[PDB]
């Protein structure tokens, strides 16, 4: 009556004590790669009709910010997807009321939405997966689906995915992040794998007929193709949790006739703007643009620091919020330009280099500082808690580079540190 | 009784990479665990300052260069390094009567080369630089304990020397770990000088035995156990210095403390030979890194070092033979990311096509099996000849996949960011 899930195995693993909130137990479980050191990540795009804006951001910047930590701080590697839903409802909306076709419009906002991650300093996937590319793929994946009696065929042409009898099978559960989220079809959760389309919608061939994928089959399609059957992570915002993800897990579950699609699911917390989640149709929100001509990247990036990614932040606009980030960022800029001299402008032959009890107090407070922020990232990569020790060790230095006679080497090597932690956080100075 | 033992770290509570080193006190590669945590506590030999540096000592501090980064910035070991400068030895005084200025100005300028040397090198500076002159008091302290340890004794001159035989009757204490078959004043020929009694002319500081000069070992003993402590992690130097050098310092150090295990693992660079022989000073076939330097660039000459494991012996062919592939990678180094940052400019997203097809496929298995390779490598006493050329092998393949293929702009970006993540563990610069 409850969803299980299986930990694997730790024999022939990377082991880094790595806890993660994994959506699929609902708790903090310990991160373990399916194979060795590396992960399998895909993570959900965005529907390219239209500007990206901050509530996005925050999503792509916090699982920016993961996959950094998880790669340049743990030394995983990392195969990650993204799909672009190129063809949709809303881009054929979109594309008939500016008179435009279908992939001009989507072209034209994926090249704006990648432009925003690159000014975000995100990272791109290995892999980008446009549906427009992937239609065989999907329809040879809703063949097999039926192959295995996990949908049926209407009259008009349509697929459905046959929750039902999906649900009898002892192997499979439906819904196994949100149990309690849930004419023609069989019931009414049924939903479509392929729809019929109207001669005036883009469509493609298939063997049931033209039509145009549903909402969720290209996720499934396009991650079984390229990383299989097992996914280390899967990500996206958490009100894709449910349909959309739990729907994928069942196409992939009926596909492979198999339990577990996905390792861990990770759900980042929405951006609220005056209590409410920023969105397209409340027209309450901020493009990446906008934002950028405001605030910089870096600046936006320490606001996403401040709030743990898997829990949801409210924005409060006429630069309340940015208050926080902007002196955070100012005193970052103002202790590197004081080391960045300090180092540049040393004297080897003038200079004593006694190793003083000054000298061994900053050290200690560096080592220290390095397992704080190792045992942070440990803990459901807490970038807030980490961004804390980084301050409280600047303070420190600051004080140091001051008063103290410096100690050249062990400027340089604090100077390295925090620069290898920037750029885990993706700062740039 | 009559072999010295060794005592492997446990690992409860360490950091466990299954990393295998080549331990002098073992002869053997033997698992790398540290004393706490993720923490190496790693002393290094500094050089004698009366002179310019030559391409054998370059080898030495670019191969420990090239492991400290390796530790540090591939496996995440959170490293504390010091590294000596004797300001004060013979062959400083020496010089310094012939060049007729200070010892002390002569030293500072000598050492203020070599640190200039290792940054055009682009070798990192040690956590601590601990130069004898500013010691010479903890100097006195330390030999004034081993003295109360009952392992030193004090000449009619005012020089002390350290008691071999006395050491070795102690159960706990062996003399000469590493090199145990290299074994007037004194008890016994063996015995060495923790202080020297003060010649006429010569610079010299105060003692209770009277005017000296710290003898030749004692330093590198007092500075690395006042900064680190009673157990060091790693400590290095080239194999030289293996007897009497560095099995004095043990000696010395597990006199102070009174212990059985100063260091645990113990790494000695092979020597860059020159026809056939040790490139030396004294045999006057050295190259200058000064000079080197004018021929060759940084990247060129850390390539010739990761070409040769670092614990083994390496033939510098003059003339610029052995230099001929060491350009010949840098250059096909700097043309791979010439190329790659023009595909990467030049890729248009409204216009391409981005199936992830067989070919990007083919490249993603040898991309991630490529970093699998270099892994094993690293964990296999630092291996960096091989895992230079496994980079190369990559590069190969990129380049043939870049000319070709429809491009994959997300798999591009990775595979640079990974070769440039390797190549700043190398210490080059593209
Ligand atoms: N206010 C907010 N705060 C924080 N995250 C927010 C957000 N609004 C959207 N998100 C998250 O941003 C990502 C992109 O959202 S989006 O452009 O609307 N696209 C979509 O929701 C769908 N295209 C995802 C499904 C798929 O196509 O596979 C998705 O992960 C989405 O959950
Ligand atoms: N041809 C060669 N090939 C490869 N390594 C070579 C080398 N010649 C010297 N080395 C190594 O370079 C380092 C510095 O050497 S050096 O400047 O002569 N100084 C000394 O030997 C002493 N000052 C070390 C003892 C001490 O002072 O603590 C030492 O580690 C030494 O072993
Ligand atoms: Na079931
Ligand atoms: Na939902
Ligand atoms: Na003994
Ligand atoms: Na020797
Ligand atoms: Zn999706
Ligand atoms: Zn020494």
């Given amino acids: 009556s409850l969803p299980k899930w299986n930990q694997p195995s730790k024999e022939g693993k990377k082991i880094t004590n790595l806890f993660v909130n994994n959506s699929l137990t609902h708790s903090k479980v310990e991160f373990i790669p399916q194979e060795g050191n590396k992960i399998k990540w895909y993570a959900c795009g965005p529907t390219v009709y239209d500007a990206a804006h901050l509530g996005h951001a925050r999503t792509y910047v916090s699982f920016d910010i993961i996959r950094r930590i998880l790669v340049n701080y ?7 997807v993204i799909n ?43 892999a980008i997966t446009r549906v427009s590319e992937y239609v065989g793929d999907i329809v040879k994946y809703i063949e097999k689906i039926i192959e ?31 149990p309690l989220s849930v004419k023609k079809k069989k019931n009414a959760y049924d939903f479509a794998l392929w729809k019929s389309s109207k001669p005036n919608e883009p469509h493609w061939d298939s063997p049931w007929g033209k039509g145009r994928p549903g909402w969720h089959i290209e996720c499934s399609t396009m991650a079984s193709n390229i990383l299989g059957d097992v996914l280390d992570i899967h990500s996206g915002g958490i009100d894709l949790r449910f349909p959309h993800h739990d729907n994928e897990l069942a196409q992939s579950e009926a596909f492979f006739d198999h339990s577990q699609w996905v390792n861990y699911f990770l759900h980042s917390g929405h951006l609220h703007i005056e209590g409410l989640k920023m969105s397209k149709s409340l027209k309450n929100f901020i493009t990446i643009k906008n934002m950028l001509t405001k605030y910089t990247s870096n600046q936006i990036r320490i606001l996403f620091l401040l709030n743990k990614w898997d829990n949801f932040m409210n924005y409060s606009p006429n630069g309340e919020s940015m208050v926080q980030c902007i002196e955070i ?11 960045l001299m300090k180092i540049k402008n040393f004297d080897l032959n003038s ?32 970038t807030p808690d980490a961004l804390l020790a980084i ?21 340089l090597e604090i100077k390295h540190y925090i620069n290898f932690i920037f750029d885990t956080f993706g700062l740039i100075y």
Wanted: proline residues 1%; glycine residues 2%.
């Fill in 391 to 411: 301050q409280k060790l600047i303070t420190e230095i600051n004080i140091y580079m001051d008063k103290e006679k410096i100690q050249i080497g062990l400027l």
């Fill in 74 to 80: 743990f030394k995983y590697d990392v195969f990650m």
């Fill in 84 to 126: 672009i839903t190129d063809i949709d409802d809303k881009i054929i909306k979109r594309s008939v009321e500016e008179k435009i076709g279908f992939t001009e419009l989507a072209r034209k906002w994926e090249y704006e939405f990648w432009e925003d991650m690159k000014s975000l300093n995100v990272l791109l996937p290995t």
């Fill in 351 to 382: 200079c004593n280099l006694y190793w003083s009890d000054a000298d061994n107090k900053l050290n200690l407070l560096f080592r220290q500082t390095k397992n704080k922020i190792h045992e942070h990232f440990l803990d459901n990569f807490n």
């Fill in 148 to 178: 295995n009696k996990y949908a049926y065929v209407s009259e008009e042409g349509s697929v459905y995915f046959d929750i039902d009898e999906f649900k009898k099978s002892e192997k499979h559960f439906y819904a196994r992040m949100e």
């Fill in 329 to 339: 960022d100012k005193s970052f800029t103002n202790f590197f330009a004081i080391i």
